Write a protein that binds this ligand. Structure first.
Ligand code: ATP
Ligand code: ATP
Ligand code: CA
Ligand code: CA
Ligand code: CA
Lengths: 302, 291
């Protein structure tokens, strides 16, 4: 039995590169050595992939952020006829574009927060802005998401963001419970709650706003059914394959989709593998399912 | 003197069109402004080696090879400015299902349709909301049309060798036109008529009635924006009862002198060599706006 040669693809620039290295190392360390011949691939520049992938049967992506999201790596691998993990080039690019992904979701009737799309030299229509109210969340579509409380803050923040990016999403702020829903091959995994830590005095909870805890949670049946329905619908709508993670906010019992991730964290401390583990899927087996399901999917694509 | 790669490639019929296109470009590119660097890709990824010799990639590509976005994404990753729409726009416009959803979300008129696959099961229900006749085309790209339930079911099986995904559209019976856009400005509209014997195909610049022209110009420009196209594009439409319908948006329209976009530009007084000058100049600006 000749072992399939798995390239573990690492790369990116700055902190993304480091997260990528850490991810690849975990994969390399947990890949079943009897099933696979493991081939670490570290990309000094993105297009070095063409040379380094000559010796692999499959590309397992350890990438993090733009390099793995924009779709170029997937498209290159496809052009080389080399099967790879996760969503394809178009699904990846769509999911990475928050504006375009929200349009498609909203077209499909999936709840997502109201928003304005704005490009760099484009003016800003204050009548539609006012419809949104304040606070607002400014999302580059290097610089992170930021809550702004009024017109002046918004203006100032647009100017900060636009120097680096040419496009922004301005989203209505929603105060609610944050959750994230991992999907593997069209099946919903355990939901994870993301909230502040509390100190409890009897039944009074005092929250620490500087903290964040992530915990697997079972939601009440009604909301659970609604959440599972929305997340799978995102998955199909955005043409995702193999696995994805949908980030949502719940208010008044209604889930809103903030984003869909085709390249979610894959370290053992990351949300998706934590969800899989709660589902009885240990890390090494999650890696087996990704390779196995990806091969099937790349074959269905031709 | 700026080094311009003329990039040609593809397989089969597409490659031939590509080489034909790149030759025309090489012939008409101003020799005083440019140093022209013919580039022919045997395999797609050979682009990486050959592109170290150039300051700009002018794409002579045709069909999926230049539509899916891999070439654009590769050149972007190499830091090499290139002509036309970027990887995301290209991929979106190549996907008829996705581009239709976005257009419709934006309130742009496009024929009613449904998405279908090899994998999935034909769903009897949704078809008959569409009625007949239907037009059947692969999702990723003459006219294949079906006048009854029987031709449809069969058509799908044959096509399904072609593509894994298919779009089924309501048949729009109308006057066919095509709208070339350059850097956000509409060029003269072209009318496309068909006759077994005229009183194959005729393409001519036609001045549309003022009102229709206005709706057409609005729709074509809205597609251009909605799909994030840049530098140039060609929107193909079907007019019925004064209402324009969008059939599709092309980020890589035919670029020969005999092709529709160059003819449209010609009708505006933009000669072939100058159209290339503008493609290069405009793309350079766009690529810089993107980062
Ligand atoms: N509309 C909103 N209302 C309230 N809080 C929000 C809203 N949008 C985002 N947030 C908070 O900001 C965080 C980050 O936003 P988001 O998930 O949309 O972008 P991202 O995760 O940074 O993008 P990427 O997928 O590139 O990592 C969310 O986890 C949530 O805590
Ligand atoms: N709904 C429709 N009703 C009537 N005629 C149509 C319809 N859709 C397409 N056609 C005809 O079929 C021809 C092909 O159009 P289509 O949109 O399928 O091109 P395409 O193959 O998607 O283009 P590309 O090569 O860029 O992928 C057109 O010339 C048009 O006349
Ligand atoms: Ca997120
Ligand atoms: Ca067409
Ligand atoms: Ca002239």
């Amino acid at each position: 039995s000749n072992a399939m040669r798995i390239g573990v693809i690492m790369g990116g620039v700055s902190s993304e590169k480091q997260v990528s290295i850490m991810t690849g190392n975990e994969m390399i360390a947990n890949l079943d050595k009897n099933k696979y011949e493991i081939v670490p691939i570290t990309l000094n520049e993105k297009m070095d992939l063409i040379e380094k992938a000559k010796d692999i049967d499959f590309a397992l992506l350890a990438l993090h952020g733009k390099y793995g999201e924009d779709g170029t790596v997937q498209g290159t691998l496809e052009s080389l006829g080399i099967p790879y993990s996760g969503s394809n080039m178009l699904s990846s690019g769509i999911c990475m574009d928050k504006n375009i992904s929200k349009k498609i979701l909203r077209y499909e009737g999936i709840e997502t927060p109201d928003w304005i799309e704005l490009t760099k030299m484009e003016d800003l229509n204050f009548d539609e802005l006012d419809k949104l109210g304040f606070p607002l969340v400014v999302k580059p579509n290097s610089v992170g998401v930021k809550i702004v409380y009024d017109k002046d803050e918004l203006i100032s923040m647009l100017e900060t963001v636009f120097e680096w990016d040419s496009e922004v999403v301005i989203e209505k702020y929603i105060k609610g419970e944050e959750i994230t829903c991992s999907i593997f091959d069209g099946k919903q995994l355990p939901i994870i709650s993301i909230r502040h830590a509390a100190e409890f005095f009897d039944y009074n909870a005092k929250y620490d706003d500087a903290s964040t805890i992530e915990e697997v949670i079972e939601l009440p049946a009604e909301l659970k059914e609604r959440v599972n329905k929305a997340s799978l619908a995102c998955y199909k709508a955005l043409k995702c394959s193999v696995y994805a993670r949908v980030d949502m906010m719940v208010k008044d019992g209604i889930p809103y989709v903030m984003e869909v991730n085709t390249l979610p964290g894959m370290t053992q401390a990351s949300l998706l593998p934590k969800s899989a583990d709660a589902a009885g899927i240990h890390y090494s087996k999650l890696l087996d399912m990704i390779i196995e399901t990806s091969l099937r999917v790349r074959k269905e694509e031709g």
